[PDB]
């Protein structure tokens, strides 16, 4: 599936660079894709700096996917 806005597209690109893989699903769970702490750290700090948002770690954990994060960012 393709990203549906600029936020989803930018976020998916961050996921890919952090997980070191192409073909990252926008709807897939971060942990089900073999995601761990090292990757989560880089992910959250990069989302915070590039989207100028104070994203809490709990918010990442509750919605650890591109689609969900894009909703939380756009608000």
């Amino acid at each position: 599936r393709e990203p549906r806005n600029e936020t989803e597209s930018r976020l998916r690109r961050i996921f890919e660079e952090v997980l070191h893989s192409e073909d990252v699903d926008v709807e897939a769970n971060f942990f089900e894709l073999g995601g761990h702490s090292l990757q989560a750290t880089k992910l959250v700090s990069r989302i915070r700096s590039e989207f100028d948002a104070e994203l809490p770690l709990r918010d990442f954990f509750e919605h650890p996917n591109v689609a969900g994060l894009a909703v939380l960012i756009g608000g």
Binding site: H36, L38, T41, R58, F61
Partner: protein
């Protein structure tokens, strides 16, 4: 309460160590089944349990047939691995471990830690005199919690204002203060530490100081600089490693002294050395109950075959109560000699902060014997919950001060002002 059966005891459950006295359980394992296979529980696999001092020592030493790169505690070992494998010292083997340890020994060697020892002694004295002046205090929060974290933070170069925040996080990473902590809250705490240090490491590489983070950022292993990721992961293991275990040892000594007033008197009256007393405090408390490995190749022990891939857990608490090594093992004896306890582990991964941990306990015992005549528990102590760590999070005490020694301490500070 004492259990006679072995099958009923589930070592993965933190509640097991609260409701039960496992002294008989460990003795039974030690004499009848030195290599015991703990069954699978829920989604967790089974694992070997090693209870004898001699076997524990032998398996800590073998980094060839056993590995740490799949985790070294139950929570990581039963999950199938540790995310920081090959990067964090404790979960790295081979050449990367030797090189990474060699750069950390530049900072944590007895030679390098001597100026820090003086700071430990001053801070510990100050805190103990405060508690003794008040009389009624909470030893955990008012004394113990304010020494180990502060020491390691000074070494690492953690700003003073962020230290209270880091203590809250540590108290959720591998052990809880509350009964039923989910894996979520622990995950969040562990990753919050990582998020904090990735910010601080980036700041120190951009503008280096003289702290340990700066030493790591300017060090080399195998002719190449350490990545920020590798520095962050080791910072995590130092802030948490240099905090909990020391803190718990310090709290346990005060509780143990009220149980054994004869041994407190020996320390108070100069009838035992601080070195000797520090070792018995460490043998008695054994705050880290277990560490673990995973077998890379097949091996035989006591007629039983440990297959490749098997989780092997070594129980320091059981090893420090072995009758074959320690005469009257369940006696608290400050004069115990020799005292070759395995509280700091053994072999290639032998505790990196062994000297620092000893110095912190040493400083506490010296301060207690000088400015205190005695103490008593006033309220209900609060146990931490963990299958890895053992100890107390809260200990209400009344301290009877040595008034002459406090007055001498105040007069001395008066002329040094």
């Amino acid at each position: 309460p004492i259990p006679d059966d072995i099958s009923t005891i589930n070592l993965t459950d933190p509640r097991t160590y609260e409701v039960n006295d496992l002294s008989e359980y460990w003795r039974q394992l030690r004499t009848t089944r030195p290599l015991y296979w703990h069954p699978p529980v829920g989604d967790a696999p089974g694992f070997w349990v090693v209870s004898r001092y001699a076997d524990v020592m032998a398996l800590y030493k073998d980094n060839k047939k056993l590995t740490s790169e799949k985790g070294n505690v139950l929570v990581t070992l039963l999950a199938g691995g540790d995310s920081a494998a090959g990067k964090m010292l404790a979960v790295t083997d081979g050449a990367m471990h030797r090189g990474l340890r060699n750069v950390l020994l530049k900072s944590f060697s007895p030679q390098a830690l001597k100026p820090i020892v003086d700071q430990i002694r001053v801070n510990t004295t100050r805190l103990v005199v405060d508690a003794a002046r008040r009389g009624e205090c909470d030893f955990a929060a008012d004394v113990a919690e304010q020494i180990p974290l502060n020491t390691i933070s000074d070494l690492l170069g953690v700003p003073a204002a962020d230290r209270e925040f880091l203590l809250k996080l540590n108290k959720s990473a591998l052990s809880s203060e509350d009964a039923d902590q989910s894996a979520t809250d622990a995950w969040l705490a562990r990753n919050e530490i990582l998020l904090y240090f990735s910010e601080l490491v980036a700041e120190r590489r951009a503008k280096p100081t003289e702290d340990v983070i700066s030493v790591l950022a300017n060090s080399m292993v195998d002719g190449k600089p350490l990545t920020e990721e590798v520095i962050v992961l080791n910072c995590y293991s130092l802030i948490l490693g240099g905090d909990e275990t020391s803190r718990l040892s310090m709290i346990d000594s005060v509780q143990t002294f009220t149980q054994y007033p004869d041994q407190w008197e020996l320390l108070r009256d100069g009838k035992v050395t601080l070195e000797s007393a520090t070792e018995e405090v460490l043998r008695w408390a054994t705050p880290a109950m277990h560490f673990g490995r995973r077998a890379v190749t097949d091996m035989e022990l006591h007629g039983q075959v440990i297959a490749a891939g098997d989780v092997v857990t070594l129980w320091n608490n059981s090893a420090n109560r072995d009758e074959e090594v320690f005469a009257d093992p369940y006696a608290f004896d400050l004069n115990r000699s020799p005292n070759k306890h395995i509280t700091f582990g053994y072999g290639p991964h032998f505790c990196l902060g062994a000297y620092l941990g000893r110095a912190e306990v040493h400083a506490l015992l010296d301060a207690l014997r000088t400015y205190t005549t005695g103490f008593e528990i006033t309220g209900e102590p609060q146990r931490i919950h963990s299958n890895f760590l053992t100890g107390l999070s809260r200990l209400p005490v009344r301290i009877q001060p040595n008034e002459a020694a406090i007055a001498a301490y105040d007069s001395d500070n008066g002329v040094r002002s």
